[PDB]
Amino acid sequence: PTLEVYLPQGHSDERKASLIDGLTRATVDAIGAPAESVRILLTELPVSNIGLGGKPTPAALPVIIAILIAGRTEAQKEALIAHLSETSASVLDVSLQSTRVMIKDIPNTDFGLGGKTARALGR
Amino acid sequence: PTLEVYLPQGHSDERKASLIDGLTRATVDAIGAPAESVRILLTELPVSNIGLGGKPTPAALPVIIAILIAGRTEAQKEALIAHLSETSASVLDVSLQSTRVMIKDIPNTDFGLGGKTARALGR
Amino acid sequence: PTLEVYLPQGHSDERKASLIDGLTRATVDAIGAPAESVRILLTELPVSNIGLGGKPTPAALPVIIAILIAGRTEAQKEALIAHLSETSASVLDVSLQSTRVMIKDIPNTDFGLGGKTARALGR
């Protein structure tokens, strides 16, 4: 899985490291991907770049995009949403109500690793 | 500019075309890019893939990611947020409060058009 | 490196496999990353979801977002833009002018591999 977290500026490097740690544990528990297959990118944004209700504010975040190879059940995705959301809210110290998760399913014909498709590789 | 717009599934081709037109006009008015440089990409997600507060629901959307070459002023970005949010809410018939906009700036050395960097093209 | 590629719906599985093959080779040639580290995420969109100049058209694509851990030089990123656009245009049988590439440098404090920061892994 590839996770991208939109978050505001100002969080310490140790907190970002603790977020990467928790989101990986969250993904392993939720959908069973091996820890080593979880890649995370944090996309820090200045407040000028963040909109909620049409106004600039860091309260619009966090937004987590999770990209998965197709095949996960609705139950797994529900658990992924719950775990990523709770982890993000607890580590970043914000309300669970403020968290957003969006899951992209990628067909195995549309995923590449090392130049071969996931379907070519058995996934 | 390149806008990725996350929507729940179900909207008609007409409504998507109305959203494509309105968000293109909103971008032109707010930051002044030529209409022909505005790309609108609608990503539709199943409700199973969309999380708000840790729970699956279409109410987490719309989320607009606006990818811009770096250089837009804070005031231009605030107008982009305002215009994209009002247009999204009106065309989709959803609360303005539910809308989210994230602006990702790309250094001119990191942005490509027709195989050349933006910095090499004078942007 | 991870490439998120937006392309019009409907290309054959063979064409998508060749795109993954070509774009991986393009990335290796451009920045010297090991092919084994290049991941590609193709996101197909129907023409009704794809706007350029405010109207639905496949000419709004291809858009390639390249996610890289920070540290690549401007010259390497320029080469990456040239190679991905070249190969995109060729495999998709589309004008070079229409290709778009956005590179997203991720600070090593902000990138996670298997629950550890890229910084902690010496990258």
XYZ file of C-alpha atoms in Angstrom:
369
model
C 0.000 0.000 0.000
C 0.959 3.619 -0.631
C -0.416 6.137 1.873
C -0.351 9.898 1.407
C -1.231 12.102 4.375
C -2.110 15.754 3.866
C -1.216 17.516 7.117
C -0.365 21.064 8.203
C 3.113 22.394 8.888
C 4.496 22.568 12.412
C 4.593 18.894 13.478
C 7.907 17.726 14.881
C 10.092 15.226 13.089
C 9.581 12.786 15.963
C 5.809 13.147 15.654
C 5.994 12.540 11.901
C 8.096 9.451 12.621
C 5.468 8.334 15.158
C 2.757 8.932 12.563
C 4.598 6.816 9.974
C 4.998 4.126 12.637
C 1.352 4.133 13.680
C -0.134 4.268 10.176
C 1.988 1.284 9.184
C 0.796 -0.720 12.198
C -2.715 0.463 11.364
C -2.453 -0.852 7.811
C -0.911 -4.196 8.825
C -3.719 -4.826 11.319
C -6.500 -3.630 9.021
C -5.751 -5.338 5.708
C -2.840 -7.651 6.517
C -0.230 -6.169 4.214
C 3.334 -6.929 5.354
C 4.768 -3.925 7.197
C 7.555 -3.667 4.629
C 5.067 -3.175 1.777
C 3.608 -0.012 3.368
C 5.054 3.152 1.797
C 4.019 6.513 3.266
C 4.401 10.068 2.038
C 3.477 12.988 4.271
C 2.504 16.102 2.292
C 2.874 19.122 4.572
C 0.924 22.204 3.484
C 1.032 25.834 4.614
C -2.262 27.200 5.917
C -2.497 29.383 2.782
C -2.869 26.156 0.752
C -5.570 24.465 2.891
C -9.285 25.118 2.479
C -12.258 24.165 4.671
C -15.690 25.520 3.849
C -14.011 27.954 1.469
C -11.631 29.531 4.004
C -7.923 28.924 4.693
C -7.435 26.836 7.837
C -5.421 23.792 8.989
C -8.699 22.355 10.351
C -9.353 20.854 6.897
C -6.703 18.191 7.580
C -5.835 15.402 7.929
C -6.788 13.760 4.624
C -5.361 10.280 4.032
C -5.255 8.754 0.559
C -4.627 4.999 0.611
C -3.763 3.258 -2.658
C -4.317 -0.519 -2.670
C -4.202 -3.245 -5.279
C -7.810 -4.204 -5.969
C -9.270 -7.173 -4.114
C -9.809 -6.050 -0.543
C -13.261 -6.692 0.921
C -15.558 -3.920 2.124
C -14.873 -5.189 5.656
C -11.113 -4.765 5.252
C -11.585 -1.275 3.811
C -13.909 -0.295 6.677
C -11.256 -1.451 9.148
C -8.579 0.420 7.202
C -10.695 3.610 7.393
C -11.222 3.141 11.134
C -7.567 2.402 11.938
C -6.005 5.100 9.756
C -8.478 7.667 11.108
C -7.985 6.794 14.802
C -4.191 6.636 14.355
C -4.025 9.968 12.544
C -6.270 11.698 15.081
C -4.414 10.334 18.098
C -0.884 11.006 16.800
C -1.639 14.439 15.364
C -3.746 15.204 18.481
C -6.909 16.272 16.641
C -10.528 15.177 16.646
C -11.436 11.909 14.965
C -14.312 13.859 13.398
C -11.821 15.945 11.369
C -10.174 12.961 9.607
C -10.875 11.969 5.989
C -9.839 8.739 4.251
C -10.036 8.009 0.528
C -9.150 4.563 -0.825
C -8.053 4.035 -4.426
C -8.316 0.482 -5.773
C -5.797 -0.327 -8.536
C -6.550 -3.336 -10.802
C -3.689 -5.817 -10.975
C -3.315 -4.996 -14.691
C -2.731 -1.335 -13.690
C -0.079 -1.783 -10.981
C 3.597 -2.092 -11.820
C 6.577 -3.178 -9.751
C 9.983 -3.383 -11.362
C 8.441 -3.049 -14.820
C 6.029 -5.993 -14.512
C 2.332 -5.801 -13.755
C 0.912 -7.083 -10.478
C -1.074 -9.677 -12.414
C 2.127 -10.857 -14.120
C 3.588 -11.209 -10.614
C 0.686 -13.153 -9.077
C -1.055 -10.314 -7.237
C -3.337 23.905 -13.189
C -4.373 20.305 -12.553
C -7.225 19.605 -10.154
C -7.975 16.139 -8.800
C -11.587 16.093 -7.592
C -12.719 13.234 -5.316
C -16.486 12.560 -5.591
C -18.771 9.728 -4.501
C -20.012 7.516 -7.300
C -23.282 8.151 -9.091
C -23.199 11.554 -10.804
C -24.442 11.917 -14.358
C -22.218 12.827 -17.292
C -24.119 16.137 -17.331
C -23.334 16.935 -13.703
C -19.675 15.986 -14.197
C -19.485 18.218 -17.255
C -21.087 21.037 -15.282
C -18.492 20.516 -12.539
C -15.671 20.438 -15.084
C -16.894 23.725 -16.579
C -17.496 25.498 -13.260
C -14.176 24.475 -11.701
C -12.357 25.561 -14.842
C -14.014 28.990 -14.686
C -13.391 29.166 -10.988
C -9.684 28.516 -11.576
C -9.472 31.111 -14.371
C -11.141 33.787 -12.225
C -9.180 33.040 -9.062
C -5.581 32.757 -10.264
C -5.800 33.799 -13.901
C -4.546 30.701 -15.677
C -5.756 30.318 -19.290
C -8.717 27.957 -19.549
C -6.757 25.762 -21.972
C -4.180 25.050 -19.247
C -6.809 23.873 -16.716
C -7.138 20.110 -16.329
C -9.992 18.766 -14.196
C -9.755 15.119 -13.204
C -12.781 13.609 -11.477
C -12.059 10.520 -9.342
C -15.239 8.744 -8.249
C -15.035 6.503 -5.199
C -17.464 3.889 -3.837
C -18.914 4.661 -0.410
C -16.947 1.651 0.886
C -13.754 3.591 0.042
C -14.689 6.946 1.634
C -14.136 7.684 5.320
C -15.220 10.557 7.570
C -14.614 10.408 11.300
C -13.454 6.827 10.870
C -16.725 5.700 9.268
C -17.699 5.031 5.637
C -19.863 7.827 4.207
C -20.046 9.976 1.047
C -20.226 13.013 3.368
C -16.414 13.005 3.512
C -16.328 14.490 -0.007
C -15.760 16.602 -2.120
C -12.007 17.023 -1.716
C -10.176 19.010 -4.401
C -6.406 18.773 -4.843
C -5.137 21.676 -6.957
C -1.636 21.188 -8.377
C -0.029 24.512 -9.332
C 3.395 25.641 -10.411
C 4.827 27.565 -7.457
C 4.499 31.331 -7.460
C 0.867 32.118 -6.657
C 0.327 34.671 -3.916
C -1.450 33.903 -0.658
C -4.375 36.060 -1.780
C -4.651 34.213 -5.108
C -4.694 30.892 -3.252
C -7.379 32.148 -0.861
C -9.501 33.130 -3.873
C -8.866 29.742 -5.474
C -10.055 28.065 -2.286
C -13.122 30.313 -2.124
C -14.103 29.895 -5.786
C -13.452 26.150 -5.994
C -15.441 25.538 -2.790
C -18.472 27.644 -3.757
C -18.588 26.153 -7.259
C -18.223 22.597 -5.926
C -20.998 23.042 -3.389
C -23.384 24.679 -5.850
C -22.872 22.222 -8.720
C -22.933 19.161 -6.440
C -25.758 20.507 -4.236
C -23.851 19.930 -0.987
C -23.006 22.106 1.988
C -20.183 24.573 1.490
C -18.966 23.361 4.884
C -18.360 19.836 3.524
C -15.913 21.063 0.842
C -12.134 20.730 1.172
C -9.374 22.177 -1.010
C -5.656 21.384 -0.821
C -3.182 23.312 -2.972
C 0.102 21.581 -3.823
C 2.798 23.897 -5.197
C 5.355 22.385 -7.577
C 8.757 24.080 -8.074
C 9.298 25.130 -11.676
C 12.242 22.684 -11.781
C 9.874 19.847 -10.785
C 7.062 20.543 -13.271
C 6.931 19.303 -16.821
C 5.059 20.294 -19.914
C 5.678 18.603 -23.212
C 8.893 17.096 -21.856
C 10.448 20.408 -20.809
C 10.620 21.898 -17.358
C 8.555 24.939 -16.444
C 11.753 26.758 -15.462
C 13.200 26.139 -18.934
C 9.972 27.536 -20.425
C 10.064 30.706 -18.304
C 7.514 29.829 -15.603
C 10.184 5.975 -6.974
C 6.398 5.819 -7.331
C 4.574 7.037 -10.383
C 0.874 7.834 -10.291
C -0.298 7.950 -13.873
C -3.673 9.307 -15.075
C -4.688 7.944 -18.480
C -7.965 7.557 -20.383
C -10.039 4.453 -19.743
C -10.099 1.642 -22.269
C -6.509 0.906 -23.288
C -5.694 -2.777 -23.687
C -4.009 -4.750 -20.933
C -1.048 -5.162 -23.303
C -0.760 -1.405 -23.778
C -0.859 -0.776 -20.034
C 1.804 -3.432 -19.478
C 4.014 -1.749 -22.088
C 3.429 1.636 -20.418
C 4.518 0.214 -17.053
C 7.559 -1.350 -18.724
C 8.459 1.832 -20.603
C 7.947 4.232 -17.694
C 10.050 2.038 -15.411
C 12.878 2.015 -17.953
C 12.377 5.772 -18.358
C 12.809 6.270 -14.609
C 15.941 4.094 -14.488
C 17.484 5.865 -17.468
C 16.691 9.301 -16.025
C 17.699 9.092 -12.342
C 19.524 5.740 -11.973
C 17.068 4.253 -9.495
C 17.072 0.443 -9.431
C 14.210 -0.907 -11.500
C 13.276 -3.106 -8.527
C 12.298 0.077 -6.633
C 10.012 1.611 -9.291
C 6.289 1.322 -8.575
C 3.607 2.512 -10.995
C -0.041 3.207 -10.199
C -2.180 3.638 -13.298
C -5.472 5.438 -12.652
C -7.875 5.077 -15.597
C -10.544 7.752 -15.954
C -13.498 7.757 -18.371
C -13.703 10.632 -20.839
C -16.712 12.022 -18.946
C -14.402 12.545 -15.942
C -11.600 14.337 -17.804
C -11.663 18.085 -18.514
C -9.333 20.307 -20.531
C -10.259 23.929 -21.122
C -13.547 23.202 -19.391
C -14.715 20.458 -21.734
C -14.519 16.646 -21.455
C -11.736 15.241 -23.613
C -8.945 12.626 -23.379
C -6.469 15.369 -24.372
C -6.400 16.438 -20.715
C -4.227 13.346 -20.141
C -1.612 11.876 -19.584
C -0.657 13.407 -16.257
C 2.202 11.711 -14.396
C 2.908 12.487 -10.752
C 6.365 11.231 -9.714
C 6.967 10.737 -5.977
C 10.659 10.801 -5.030
C 12.545 10.970 -1.775
C 14.269 14.343 -1.796
C 17.855 14.610 -2.968
C 17.686 14.304 -6.735
C 19.351 17.124 -8.638
C 17.603 19.600 -10.912
C 19.340 17.962 -13.880
C 18.069 14.516 -12.882
C 14.539 15.835 -12.424
C 14.771 17.511 -15.834
C 15.876 14.176 -17.321
C 13.001 12.388 -15.561
C 10.518 14.822 -17.083
C 12.005 14.339 -20.537
C 12.103 10.534 -20.326
C 8.624 9.954 -18.839
C 7.023 12.342 -21.338
C 8.893 10.768 -24.274
C 7.847 7.258 -23.270
C 4.281 8.257 -22.367
C 3.805 9.921 -25.746
C 5.243 6.893 -27.553
C 3.362 4.084 -25.787
C 0.029 5.948 -25.641
C 0.372 7.262 -29.238
C -0.237 10.814 -28.100
C 1.540 14.105 -28.746
C 4.606 14.882 -26.656
C 3.166 18.388 -26.183
C 0.150 17.006 -24.302
C 2.184 15.193 -21.627
C 2.342 16.595 -18.089
C 4.752 15.530 -15.336
C 4.736 16.731 -11.723
C 7.577 15.680 -9.428
C 6.845 15.622 -5.698
C 10.062 15.639 -3.654
C 9.399 14.181 -0.194
C 11.760 15.198 2.651
C 13.376 12.163 4.244
C 11.654 13.110 7.525
C 8.330 12.829 5.669
C 8.696 9.514 3.854
C 7.964 6.151 5.423
C 9.272 2.737 4.381
C 7.947 -0.192 6.405
C 7.186 2.021 9.408
C 10.599 3.748 9.517
C 11.454 7.181 8.159
C 13.697 7.462 5.121
C 15.874 9.592 7.339
C 16.259 6.819 9.876
C 17.169 4.435 7.028
C 20.014 6.719 5.938
C 18.249 8.079 2.836
